[PDB]
């Protein structure tokens, strides 16, 4: 047979994420159960008892040979087994082998879960996994409509933070990237924008990481300065260490060379007593799985892969082995030497496979003409979606992923502008797709967006600045606009100055005053 089920999970005791992970491990170990998709991780206000620790919540989609009743027993076994060394595992919905929702109303078991339409912490992660046309079996209304209805009440009690796990550090509490969303109807990120500082460990151009190249002591001092500049106005900073050039047609450092450039420097930052370690997050810009693996060993938090797994087929396997590492899935085409030729987006690669496209949970066939105005962002969204599907198929968890539409990567200067304008569409883009004899639903809602506009050629074209070094002021303006269009993180060169821009844009657009 193989039936389908959606289960809600939650914990508000101790290491909540470890309780969740253990429950998912226990499910997966069953011969009768197959994990298909997991939602983002959300933090929510306790619904019933406000004096308690906030809950960590999500949803998991499984394929199972078990009957509803057999599955419920397993959920109870798991809850008990976890208590042995604190986790709730409920059946939310259960579909038969034909993909139809079943209803059970027995003394012991009620499917769908009787409380689900009351709880944003159920519906939000659930609707990351089910499409806008999925109806509630009892009400016959789309579940997304029931979600919208809850948000429409405008109770801050119903508000969710999304948490993206970061690695544990000794003596430190569990670490996350955090994103709070609010509604007004439109949904908007209202927590501070993350600043990612660029650090190039390449010899490429004297003006940018050029002179201190291969000198770890000098480089570290540069990084201490960056952190001080950023932390003046911000609570956190990400330092993105890059040992490989990603500029169109640039010669590629060897792996051994990239490792030598990046890894000792990450080790040195992480070991520094001159840095406030708790406010400093470490990223490595690499498309190489082995470099990522080495970086993880020396205490990196984020793998920033401009190819989204395209350059190394073992990258996803590395990320999958490290559930507390954060992975940036960036959009590109071809490779570094050919991408310039591939900036053409009229035709849709997976066009034939696409069954249905949705913007803000509405079929775009019914938002007529929007389709014609959003060719580029939907094309980029589908290609990000395809990378995402392959990541999930290779053990990467949705909860680990940030997305980046990849400004400048197989895109012209006019296209980069259009991508900035259309971030709100991207953030609310979803589609169903035929994939290996069965249907798959890709939902970009809640996937935090990183943009890297800094010093890019597209700015220079408009401001007539030939040299990249003189594009910092203009970058300030563009960064403000990126945030205004919904960017959750920005990658920048001029940290001291862009920090001011980010803070102002956050005040203006987010009310963070
Ligand atoms: N935010 C939040 N509040 C809560 N309050 C009670 C229960 C326990 O619910 P059950 O007894 O129906 O499983 N679970 C949650 C939860 O998961 N999240
Ligand atoms: N995630 C992400 N990573 C990147 N790495 C390098 C560059 C090229 O810029 P640089 O050569 O000035 O670092 N741009 C990006 C980007 O836009 N997004």
UniProtKB/Swiss-Prot annotation:
Record EC number: 4.1.2.25, 2.7.6.3, 2.5.1.15
Example of a GO cellular component annotation carried by this entry: mitochondrion
Biochemical pathway: Cofactor biosynthesis; tetrahydrofolate biosynthesis; 2-amino-4-hydroxy-6-hydroxymethyl-7,8-dihydropteridine diphosphate from 7,8-dihydroneopterin triphosphate: step 3/4; Cofactor biosynthesis; tetrahydrofolate biosynthesis; 2-amino-4-hydroxy-6-hydroxymethyl-7,8-dihydropteridine diphosphate from 7,8-dihydroneopterin triphosphate: step 4/4; Cofactor biosynthesis; tetrahydrofolate biosynthesis; 7,8-dihydrofolate from 2-amino-4-hydroxy-6-hydroxymethyl-7,8-dihydropteridine diphosphate and 4-aminobenzoate: step 1/2
Keywords for this protein: Acetylation, ATP-binding, Folate biosynthesis, Kinase, Lyase, Magnesium, Membrane, Metal-binding, Mitochondrion, Multifunctional enzyme, Nucleotide-binding, Phosphoprotein, Transferase
Region (HPPK): 2-162
Domain Pterin-binding: 193-503
Keyword DNA-binding: no
Swiss-Prot/TrEMBL catalytic activity: 7,8-dihydroneopterin = 6-hydroxymethyl-7,8-dihydropterin + glycolaldehyde; 6-hydroxymethyl-7,8-dihydropterin + ATP = (7,8-dihydropterin-6-yl)methyl diphosphate + AMP + H(+); (7,8-dihydropterin-6-yl)methyl diphosphate + 4-aminobenzoate = 7,8-dihydropteroate + diphosphate
Cofactor(s) this protein requires: Mg(2+)
GO function terms (MF aspect): 2-amino-4-hydroxy-6-hydroxymethyldihydropteridine diphosphokinase activity; ATP binding; dihydroneopterin aldolase activity; dihydropteroate synthase activity; kinase activity; metal ion binding
Residue positions binding Mg(2+): 200
Binding, (7,8-dihydropterin-6-yl)methyl diphosphate: 247, 285, 304, 404, 456, 491-493
GO BP annotations, alphabetical order: folic acid biosynthetic process; tetrahydrofolate biosynthetic process
Region annotated DHPS, chain positions: 195-513
Keyword Phosphoprotein: yes
Cellular localization per UniProt: Mitochondrion membrane
Family according to the record: In the N-terminal section; belongs to the DHNA family.
Known partners and oligomeric status: Homodimer. Interacts with NAP1.
Role played: Catalyzes three sequential steps of tetrahydrofolate biosynthesis.
Protein name in the entry: Folic acid synthesis protein FOL1
Gene expressing this chain: FOL1
